[PDB]
C-alpha cells in the first residue's frame, strides 16, 4: 500500500474546522443534531419534595404513638394535598406525587395494614425515607449536556423535563455530490456498449442523507473540461465538502487531474488498505473534496472509513463518527495478504455458548456488492497479518445503520 | 411480575397482520422502506464468462505438451479478443476481460516465466480454473431479493445496478399518538402546582419518526371523557396503531379506562419486568392500541421492547426490530431482584486484553432518565437471577441508533 490509513485520517482531520453556524430548533426536530451550546438546567430536579412510592405521609411522632392513623386526605400527580393534616393522621399519596408540608416520611402500602379506625404501620419508619429531595438529580444553573453532544432520544426528553422547548443546533453539513464518464447510464436506460449502470452516486447520497448531510446531487456530469469545470465551480460555492463518486481521477493522468490540480490543492493517496487504495483529498476554494475510486466495493468502503469520520468532525460532533470493534474468533479461515489492512466483511453470530464468532460472507473480492448485505461486520485484519485459521482471535466492527441490521 | 415478556410479545405478533398497501418509489427515496414484491434480475451479471485475475487463456492441449506458448492476442476490460486462436498460443488477458471462445482456462500470469520466445506455464493447470462464468453473479430472472427486505445501502446500490429506477415499497406505518393530565404542561409554558413537563410524549415521537413510521401526534387530551373519546375516534380513523404516551389507564380504574373498554377489546397486562410493568393492548375498531405507564424510564422501555417489534411486523419486515444479545463479564457488581426480568442500563467497553465488558451507568431507578445517555446497552438479567458479582457472565443488548448507538 504506502500510506496507513490512521496517517490518512490523521491528515484528514487535523486540517478540518468543525462548523459553528446554528440554528434555533423544536426538540422534535433535534434528532441527529449537533448541540450548538451547553444546554444549563433553568431548573432544580427534582422540582419538589416528592413520593417515592405509593402509600402514606407521616411523622415520626404519630408513627410512635402506636395507634391507627385515619387518612386526612391524599395527595395525587396532578393535585397535591392542602388540607389541614391534624395529629394522629397520615395522607394517602401516589408515587411522584408532592409529599404534603410537614411530612417526615412516606411509608410503602405494603408495610401497613389496614384497619377500622385509621391505617396501621408495620414497619420500622425512618426519618426522612422514600422522600425524593428536590433537586436531587440535577441542580439548577448546572451543565446538563454540553456542546458537541450528538441529540438523540437520550437527550431530547430529559431537556424537555427541563421546560426547555428548543435548542440551538450546528447547521447540516452541506455535501456536493456528482460522478463523471460517458459509460455510465442511468438506471433506466438503455446500456449500449461497454457501458455501466451509474451506483457509487445512489450509494454515497444514501449514506449522506441517513448520516443527516444536505446532500447537492449534480448528477452525472458530461465527459468535458467546460462541464467539469462548472460543476466543481458550482458545487464548492454550495457545499462544505465536494464528493466524487467516480469518474475524476484519483491518480491516473487525465484531463480531470489536470482540471483538479487548477482548481485547489489536492493530495493523491494511495492507502496500504483493502479493498480501495486511491483516494483524493484536498481544499478546493471553500469547501474539501473527497475523490473515491470508482470500484463499488472500493469507494462505499474508502467513503465508510474516509468521509464518514470527516463528516462527523465537520458536523460538530465531539464524538467518532464509526462503531467500536471487539475482539472475536473466526469459525471461517480468511485469506489474507501482508501489506494491507483488509477489511473484510463478515457475518458475526452466537454459537452454542451464546459465544460471539465470525463467517466469511464467502468471496472477498470486490467484483461484487453481496458481502455488504450478507455480511453485517467487517472483519478488521491487521496490515501485517497473514492468513488466519478457525479458532484465531480477529478484530470485529458491526455494521452501523447504513447497512441496516 | 405476572406475564412474561415472551408471552406478551407473542400474544402480540400473534395477533398482528403484516400490511400490504404498496407504492412504488425512486430507490434514493427507499432506505428503510420494506419490498413489497421480489426483486427478479431483469440481465445476468457478468453478461459472459471472464477472467478471475491477469494471466493468460489456453486450452489443456497446448499446456499438455509441455512447451513455451506464444502470446497471440489480449482481452482486456472492455476490450475482448476475436478472430483466430492459433492451435499452439495463448492469449493474454486482464481480470474481468472476457474469456475467447474455446477458453479452458486462465492462469495467473504469476505461474508463467516468460521465455523469450513463448510463455512458460509453471504449476500445472486445472481446467475452468479463473473463469467467471456468466450469470455467475446474478442470473436473468433470478430472485435478488425477497419481499420483506429492509432495503438499505446494501441493498439499493444492487437493485440498480440491475437497471431497476424504482421499486414497490409497503406502505409506512400510520401511529397516532397522544397523551392526557391537566398535569402535563408543555415546555415553554409556566409550571403550576405540583405540575410537570409532558415528556413520553416527545420520547414516543422521536422514536416513530426514527423507525421510519407516518406520526399524527395530537398533543396532550384534555382530562375529559368526550375530549379523550374525540381523541381516540380520530387517532384510530387515522393510523394503523394508537399510542397513549401516558394519562390513559394502564390497569388503575378511572374514566379513561371505561372510554378504553368500550372503545375496544383492550387487556390490561402486568409485565415480569423491570423498569415498568403495566401495559395496556388491544384493537379498537380500525387500528391497534398500546397503553404506556407514566414513568418516562418505564414508558421508553415498554415502547422500546414491546411496541417496536409490533410496528416491525406491520411494516411488512421480515426480519427483528431490536439488536441480538451478546454474552459478556460484568465489571461491575449489580444488585438484582429475582422475579423480574430486569432491563438495566450499562456501559459496554473493551478492557486491556481488548476484552468486550460491561459496567453499570449507576442507579439504576426509574427516578432519572439519564441511564440511557450515560450508557450504550441494556445488560438483561434473567428473571430468576440475584445479585451478581463481578467476573460473573451476563447477557447485553446494544441501544440501536434510536439511542447513539
Chains 1, 2 share one sequence.
Not at 393534616?85 to 401497613?112: F, H, S
Not at 447540516?172 to 442511468?186: C, H, I, N
Not at 459465544?355 to 470486490?366: A, C, R, Y
Request: some cysteine; overall charge negative; charged content about 20%.
Amino acid at each position: 500500500g504506502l500510506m496507513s490509513l490512521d496517517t490518512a485520517l490523521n491528515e484528514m482531520l487535523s486540517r478540518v474546522t468543525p462548523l459553528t453556524a446554528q440554528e434555533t430548533l423544536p426538540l422534535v426536530q433535534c434528532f441527529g443534531r449537533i448541540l450548538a451550546s451547553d444546554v444549563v438546567s433553568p431548573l432544580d430536579v427534582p422540582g419538589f419534595d416528592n413520593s417515592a412510592m405509593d402509600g402514606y405521609a407521616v411523622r415520626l411522632a404519630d408513627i410512635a404513638s402506636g395507634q391507627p392513623l385515619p387518612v386526612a386526605g391524599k395527595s395525587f400527580a396532578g393535585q397535591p394535598y392542602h388540607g389541614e393534616w391534624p395529629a394522629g393522621t397520615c395522607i394517602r399519596i401516589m408515587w411522584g406525587a408532592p409529599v404534603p408540608e410537614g411530612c417526615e416520611a412516606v411509608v410503602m402500602q405494603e408495610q401497613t395494614e389496614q384497619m377500622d379506625n385509621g391505617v396501621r404501620f408495620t414497619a420500622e419508619v425512618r426519618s426522612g425515607q422514600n422522600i425524593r429531595r428536590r433537586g436531587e438529580d440535577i441542580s439548577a444553573g448546572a451543565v446538563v449536556f454540553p456542546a458537541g453532544t450528538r441529540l438523540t432520544t437520550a437527550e431530547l426528553p430529559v431537556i424537555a423535563s427541563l421546560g426547555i422547548a428548543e435548542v440551538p443546533v450546528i447547521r447540516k453539513v452541506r455535501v456536493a455530490l456528482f460522478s463523471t464518464g460517458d459509460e455510465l447510464q442511468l438506471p433506466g436506460q438503455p446500456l449500449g456498449d461497454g457501458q455501466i449502470y451509474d451506483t457509487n452516486r445512489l450509494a454515497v447520497h444514501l449514506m449522506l442523507e441517513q448520516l443527516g448531510c444536505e446532500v447537492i446531487n449534480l448528477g452525472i456530469i458530461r465527459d468535458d473540461p467546460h462541464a467539469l469545470r462548472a460543476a466543481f465551480i458550482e458545487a464548492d460555492s454550495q457545499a462544505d465538502v465536494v464528493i466524487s463518486s467516480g469518474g475524476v481521477s484519483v491518480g491516473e493522468a487525465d484531463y480531470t487531474k489536470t482540471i483538479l490540480e487548477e482548481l485547489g490543492e489536492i493530495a493523491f493517496w494511495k492507502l496500504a488498505i483493502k479493498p480501495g487504495k486511491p483516494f483524493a483529498f484536498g481544499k478546493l476554494s471553500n469547501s474539501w473534496f473527497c475523490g473515491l475510486p470508482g470500484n463499488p466495493v472500493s469507494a462505499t468502503l474508502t467513503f465508510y472509513q474516509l468521509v464518514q469520520p470527516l463528516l462527523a468532525k465537520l458536523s460538530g460532533n465531539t464524538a467518532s463518527g464509526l462503531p467500536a470493534r471487539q475482539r472475536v474468533r473466526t469459525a471461517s479461515r480468511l485469506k489474507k495478504t501482508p501489506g494491507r489492512l483488509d477489511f473484510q466483511r463478515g457475518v458475526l453470530q452466537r454459537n452454542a455458548d451464546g459465544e460471539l464468532e465470525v463467517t466469511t460472507t464467502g468471496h472477498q473480492g470486490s467484483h461484487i456488492f453481496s458481502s455488504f448485505s450478507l455480511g453485517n461486520c467487517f472483519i478488521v485484519l491487521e496490515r501485517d497479518r497473514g492468513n488466519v485459521e478457525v479458532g484465531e482471535w480477529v478484530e470485529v466492527e458491526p455494521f452501523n445503520a447504513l447497512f441496516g441490521g
